[PDB]
Design a protein around this ligand. Structure first.
Ligand SMILES: Nc1nnc(-c2ccccc2O)cc1N1CC[NH2+]CC1
Length: 121
């Protein structure tokens, strides 16, 4: 809540981590793996997703939760990113493009978080 903000360095690290996850591009393919995950379609647009996924989330919402200080730790942020990817893996088949992209984005998050959490070490 804005009534009691996070320390500014935490907000800054959250933003740096999510920005790097969103910008990640495979070199061999050129594709920004996050693009399909920025905004989930609405219930009227993709009702099958909401029948299968109990807790929908997208990167648009994750960015809002950084800016509103809803996440109180990098762990809080990580839980939502991993929820997004697990949701993608539940709605899509193993080996499909969107499933596999979400697997890589999990690893990108873990790698980026390690670098940024320790950048003052
Ligand atoms: N198949 C799909 N799987 N997952 C997502 C998705 C989007 C945001 C956050 C989490 C997600 O899982 C979107 C998908 N669609 C691709 C085809 N166009 C409609 C949307």
């Amino acid at each position: 809540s804005m009534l009691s903000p996070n320390p500014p360095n935490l907000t800054k690290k959250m933003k740096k981590i999510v920005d790097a996850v969103i910008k990640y591009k495979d070199s061999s393919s050129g594709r920004q793996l996050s693009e399909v995950f920025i905004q989930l379609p609405s219930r009227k647009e993709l009702p099958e997703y909401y029948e299968l996924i109990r807790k929908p989330v997208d990167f648009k919402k994750i960015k809002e939760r950084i800016r509103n200080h809803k996440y109180r730790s990098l762990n809080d942020l990580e839980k939502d990113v991993m929820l997004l990817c697990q949701n993608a893996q539940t709605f899509n088949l193993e080996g499909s493009l969107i499933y596999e992209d979400s697997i890589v984005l999990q690893s990108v998050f873990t790698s980026v978080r390690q670098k940024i959490e320790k950048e003052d070490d």
